[PDB]
Design a protein around this ligand. Structure first.
Ligand code: NAP
Ligand code: BFI
Length: 316
């Protein structure tokens, strides 16, 4: 298994990265330091995670210690929904760069296709609990992302949580300057995304799988929800390979030519999760894992379901 995948800008993206959603500031600096020490070179960040300063601390320390050089790292961040207005995009990117202590991002994503009312609150709600949209649209936000590439702030741009019609809208823009390099989407054995992955890969867009472990730590989890990491069928596949369930869940998307970004702040798990380049899932294992699909999505938000651009009404 080759460790990097070629993007449309000629750059190579590591297929395994470290996720940072719900990595608390008081723990994420150590997580990123350990990750770099054990071989991670891709870190998935976002302004909405409220920890970019502490991620940046770790990166800065490992650059100063001469453990890695900047060109070897692949740092991803994302434009939050309250910054979709064309006049707000650059500032949002520069805030992320300042927090991360970087002079460029390797990849910058539109975090969701939905623009929200600008302001301090990340999730601005009306008095009845509905998200308050902004009068923004995907194509104008994309054009503002393109300017970031032209100014050297980011090397590549992409999208996240876009359905295929939303991807198509960008692809079909006449004066398109840059195609999206990546679509980052939820993907795991309970949400295998066959149709959207086929679509994106057919269009030369690399897919990154988020929540590959099923995001057990997500704040809206209900005790009756399915649990990937505790699924005895997946456990049995892992035992056959003398691997952990998490290792199987990370290797699975890798064998579908996806990038994958498992999150941990636990040093032993950060190290375990990287040890996925030394075994292979069989054809039968892959078929079995794909067969667990239930179209079950962990990242969904009821308050956002009436937004005009909410992505999950479409089949894919
Ligand atoms: N673009 C988007 O809209 C979007 C949405 C969701 C996620 N993401 C990105 O994708 C990343 C990954 O998704 P996620 O954070 O939702 O969840 P995940 O990676 O599926 O699961 C993370 C959870 O698994 C635990 N864990 C990690 N390794 C483990 C192991 N070896 N054994 C047992 N438990 C283990 C973690 O615990 P500890 O940390 O306590 O060890 C944490 O509770 C995010 O952090 C974020 O970077 C992006
Ligand atoms: O990595 C992540 C997890 C994520 C996130 O955004 N990126 C997340 O999917 N959701 C759910 C969500 C947000 C916005 C829209 Br639109 C739909 C939706 F399902 C959240 O509410 C959320 C809340 C605070 C976060 F720091 C991260 C999230």
């Amino acid at each position: 298994m080759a460790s990097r995948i070629l993007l449309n800008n000629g750059a190579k993206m590591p297929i395994l990265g470290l996720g940072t959603w719900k990595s608390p500031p008081g723990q994420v600096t150590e997580a990123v330091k350990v990750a770099i020490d054990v071989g991670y070179r891709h870190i998935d960040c976002a302004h909405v995670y409220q920890n970019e300063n502490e991620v940046g601390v770790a990166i800065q320390e490992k650059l100063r210690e001469q453990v890695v050089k900047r060109e070897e790292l692949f740092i991803v961040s994302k434009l939050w929904c309250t910054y979709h207005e064309k006049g707000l995009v650059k500032g949002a990117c520069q805030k992320t760069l300042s927090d991360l202590k970087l002079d460029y991002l390797d990849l910058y994503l539109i975090h969701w296709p939905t623009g929200f009312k600008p302001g301090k609150e990340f999730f601005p709600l009306d008095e009845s609990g509905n998200v308050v949209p902004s009068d923004t649209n995907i194509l104008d936000t994309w054009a503002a992302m393109e300017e970031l590439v032209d100014e050297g702030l980011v090397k590549a741009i992409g999208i996240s949580n876009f359905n295929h019609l939303q991807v198509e809208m960008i692809l079909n823009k006449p004066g398109l300057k840059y195609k999206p390099a990546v679509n980052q989407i939820e993907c795991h054995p309970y949400l295998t995304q066959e149709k959207l992955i086929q679509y994106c890969q057919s269009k030369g867009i690399v897919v990154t799988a988020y929540s590959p472990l099923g995001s057990p730590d997500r704040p809206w989890a209900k005790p009756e929800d399915p649990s990937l990491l505790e699924d005895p069928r997946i456990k049995a596949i892992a035992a056959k390979h003398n691997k952990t369930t998490a290792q199987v869940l990370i290797r699975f998307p890798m064998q579908r030519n996806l990038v994958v970004i498992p999150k941990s702040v636990t040093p032993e798990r950060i190290a375990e999760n990287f040890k996925v380049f030394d075994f292979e899932l069989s054809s039968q294992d892959m078929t079995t894992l794909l067969s667990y699909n239930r179209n079950w999505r962990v990242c969904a938000l009821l308050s956002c379901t009436s937004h005009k651009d909410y992505p999950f009404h479409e089949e894919f």
